[PDB]
Amino acid sequence: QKRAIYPGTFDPITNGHIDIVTRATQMFDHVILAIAASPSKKPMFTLEERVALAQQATAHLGNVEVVGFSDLMANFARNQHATVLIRGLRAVADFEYEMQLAHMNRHLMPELESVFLMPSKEWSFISSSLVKEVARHQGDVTHFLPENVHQALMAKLA
Amino acid sequence: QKRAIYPGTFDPITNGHIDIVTRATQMFDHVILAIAASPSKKPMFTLEERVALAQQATAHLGNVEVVGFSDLMANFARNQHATVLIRGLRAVADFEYEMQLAHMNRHLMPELESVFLMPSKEWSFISSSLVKEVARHQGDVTHFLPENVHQALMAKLA
Amino acid sequence: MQKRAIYPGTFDPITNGHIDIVTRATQMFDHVILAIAASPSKKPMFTLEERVALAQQATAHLGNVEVVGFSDLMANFARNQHATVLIRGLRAVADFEYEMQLAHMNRHLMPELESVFLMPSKEWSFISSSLVKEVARHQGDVTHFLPENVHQALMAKLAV
Amino acid sequence: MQKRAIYPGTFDPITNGHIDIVTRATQMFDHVILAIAASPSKKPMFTLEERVALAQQATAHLGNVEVVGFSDLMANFARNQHATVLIRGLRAVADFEYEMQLAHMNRHLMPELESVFLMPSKEWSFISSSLVKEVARHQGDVTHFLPENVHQALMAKLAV
Amino acid sequence: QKRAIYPGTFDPITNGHIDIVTRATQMFDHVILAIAASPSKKPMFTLEERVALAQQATAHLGNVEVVGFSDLMANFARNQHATVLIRGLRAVADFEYEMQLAHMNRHLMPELESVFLMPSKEWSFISSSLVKEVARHQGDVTHFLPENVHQALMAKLA
């Protein structure tokens, strides 16, 4: 059984994140969608809310397990018995910072292989930050989020 | 009559912004210089101050109208009857984020065409953030700002 | 204002990406000249006469587009055509550094010509005539990226 | 899952950077095909037969690697080989824009083939077969970047 | 005597910074390692702590002088009689912002030449921010910092 971890802040999980985790499940036997607490980023949704949103958004994917964590990512991956670390790559700006993280994760856990997947063109220009910015100004974001997440974002900003 | 909108935080408006809006007025019949409230950015100048500075800095340009807004940019553009959205492109770092915004604005208002203009080499390495950082340390920024803006920045930091 | 814009390139062959850009340009400016470079440094797959006929047929539905061939420096042609706008398509995979060099050089050559960068649909943001030709030459399906007349001409060209 | 992956390229010659990537791929997937392009647009320094023999010797220690030559479009070969994973090495100096074009085009051609990007060690993150050949041709020491069999073959090739 | 300044926040100084300053001392007669107060960045270590850490980490380098400053960088360089400004370049993301700073410093002091040096591959993917993020999660950062700095970071987070 090959175990992969897909870590991130997921504040909130978007269709771009769903695209990446779906590609991951077609490649690996078990995928852990791992939500980092990320207090330095001052998230809109609590960790508990982010976990609940992601569980509902991924319930159709049989081999996805949603787990929250506050640990060092590499220690959490070792403790999940993961040997693959999934990250999505949209453009050049992502690439540079992704290299730094991956080289640091390799120093902390050499057997954890970072693998980058590319989202559909449909989600190549979106991010959680961009969707929240549009939604704060009452712009329509239904196209970019799972139905349960869209409802939760509308309710959070109401 | 072709109507273009040039939106931004303009905290404060610089010679780089003046260069872009001047190029815009040579191309389109009416240009709306639209100043976003931008509370998430914690601006140095209030919206009212930014509007007053931009009005004075653009008074020599007959077809420029300066307006403040707190709305979703795309809704403000529809409400101004604008069909062109002007953005300045200085370098690669701008380009990536500009694509995300433009693809989102296209999703929100498909008839609003984003057009990117390139500033003079003279202003290709400056930004409102950089000018404020130099000015906070009492460095000379007279070369980068309209006279009224330079006075206001000196007075604000005095 | 009665603006004249130029949209230059090799168009070897014209793709759906080029059609997207020129369509956007026609919604913005009164007259758009789709200008096809006669003698590119790299021998084109299609001759200048073939490239012009394909672009004409593919843009026939756009009333304010004029397809013309040119052999001089793009700024010299723009000046002679009384164009004040230079259309550049900016894909998600474009060499932005080259675009900056080109635009500053074009501004030195003709200051009255303003470079305007337009963004294609996400659908065409990751293609190029170069990539399309390479794939088609290597027996790959490129129908999705081309106007029907171009697809027919490319199959005929690759059959010989 | 019994995954089959393809790792395509010119491998002219195979470097320690390529060995690093293919080694990482073998730790992730059940079967890895190191696929060597037969007729690249630019005449290779080593013939296809030389490139295959060097890659075979350099990967002989990896039990789940199969070295094979191919002459079709990389997606057409992947489809015929029943591969569902496409390995791409991402160096700190790679043309990420080109990688995005390639991956979106490969997804159009074969949607069931997933592009996976692997990162080489920092040690090989700033090299390429191109840079290595250019240095070696100009009398520079490249021993550090190549498997021993490749170093011996390159010295013999440059001596003639 | 050629005098160079190597300015930065150095919060804290890393092996990457040591690599750059060592290369600088092999090229120029006297190198001033200049630590900016940087209040806008909300540093982990006080200026006094950053100066003490850098002094101890560079004591083996005979021609390095460690000095703290709150002034405009260019005025501090003029006041140190420096004619060279050293900056490290790791990747593309650094390059763009470095150009803006260097063109501004050239406007403020034309005789101060900005020179960029490239660190070893070993330190090409690290930063003070990344090392602090790993250390906040109790990850091992001994490989990336001088011994005195590692101790101080462990003690600060204890």
Place this chain on the structure above:
Amino acid sequence: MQKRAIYPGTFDPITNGHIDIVTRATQMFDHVILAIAASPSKKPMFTLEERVALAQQATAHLGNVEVVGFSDLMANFARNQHATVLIRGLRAVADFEYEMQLAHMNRHLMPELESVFLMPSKEWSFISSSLVKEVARHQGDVTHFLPENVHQALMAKLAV
């Protein structure tokens, strides 16, 4: 310290961008060798003898510049010249990825040679000898980008 620096390139032809960089290098280092590559992979517009004479005339006012031709690997020449500094000009439009590859490879070849990157004036930050030649060949005005002797030589070269 009595530092010797090398500033290598094709200089085909030397531009105001190159003059800006070498001038900055002379204000920093005791001796600057402007090193002209003899046999570039792409046949140069000007011969090595023409490139040397033009660079000599254009730098005659700088007392600590020595113009010399070289045909070996740039690190092999730097070593033989006892240079410890390698000058690289970094334009706003330079391939930074290539510069990183080059500098890490040069450090592997000669660890005692330190690569130093200098920034040209904003005025020359968007040009290249390549762009200048292409424009001049296509009947464009490039006088602003070149020393007067180079402008005269380029007009004579293009007239034939």
